[PDB]
């Protein structure tokens, strides 16, 4: 009965840029999801394919915890069936997702005077990501008929852009930390259970 190490995910001092989202595998442990659900710190707590009322009564083969920073008005893209720059090019949930999405405002940690440089997102991609796909490449995006030949400029775009979070931004443009919990059930022994 070791307790699941969710603190390492939720309380990490730095989070990943969404294009380079992080994942931690959680297994062989007991989780009290009510602590997360009841925390006043989280302004989003939305589950799909499972009801919150059941989280402490179920066992799963593995839980994955993916985490990253996006801007507030993009949190809505972290849900099945959604679209936009984040869902299309950065982090994509599947239609049949079973899991929960948890988010909170991180303006106090993730903005900087003069604009934070640390948090980037992919702005251009030739096709949409498949669910749970990850793209950390930085090839020049060729927007037109002229080959870019490894040089950024007209019609030749570097594909990642900084959010530039500044503490004075409006709330929709402020950083939010996001943790996505996936509940995986395989034909294998369950290892992560509620209490």
């Amino acid at each position, epitope marked *: 009965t070791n307790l699941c190490p969710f603190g390492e995910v939720f309380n990490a001092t730095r989070f990943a840029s969404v294009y380079a989202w992080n994942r931690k595998r959680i297994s062989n442990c007991v989780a009290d999801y009510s602590v997360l659900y009841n925390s006043a710190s989280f302004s989003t707590f939305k589950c799909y394919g499972v009801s919150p009322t059941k989280l402490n009564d179920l066992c799963f083969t593995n839980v994955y915890a993916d985490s990253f920073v996006i801007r507030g008005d993009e949190v809505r893209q972290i849900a099945p069936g959604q679209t936009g720059k984040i869902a299309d090019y950065n982090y994509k949930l599947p239609d049949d997702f079973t899991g929960c999405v948890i988010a909170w405002n991180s303006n106090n940690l993730d903005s900087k005077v003069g604009g934070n*440089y640390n948090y980037l997102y992919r702005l251009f991609r030739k096709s949409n990501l498949k669910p749970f796909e990850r793209d950390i490449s930085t*090839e020049i995006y060729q927007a037109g008929s002229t080959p870019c030949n490894g040089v950024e400029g007209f019609n030749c775009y570097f594909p990642l852009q900084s959010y*530039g979070f500044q503490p004075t931004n409006g709330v929709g443009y402020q950083p939010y930390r996001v943790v996505v919990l996936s509940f995986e059930l395989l034909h294998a022994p369950a290892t992560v259970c509620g209490p």
Partner: nanobody
Amino acid sequence: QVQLVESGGGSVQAGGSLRLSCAASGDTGRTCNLVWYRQAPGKELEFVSSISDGSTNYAGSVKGRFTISQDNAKNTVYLQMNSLKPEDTAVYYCAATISRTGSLWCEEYWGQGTQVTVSS
């Protein structure tokens, strides 16, 4: 336990040169890629150059003047900056995606920045 440490910034006269270094240390595994960016305060972070598995790219404004290279024997990438111009003044940052021992996931790390100031 991976860290990126920059070195090499400073003040130079227009036309001069500097060489920046971005050195990875700790429980490093494979580097998937590495990007040099620059930002002056309040301005949007700007792409400068990147390198991945030997392929390189550059901002149009620095192509021909700056060269990115991977050290043939060290966990370090250099940015050689020649023919410097006042417009090159900024804090330069490296960012890399690197897996750590025990993992196949390349995770993002950032250097601490180095000021470059070019005066006319």
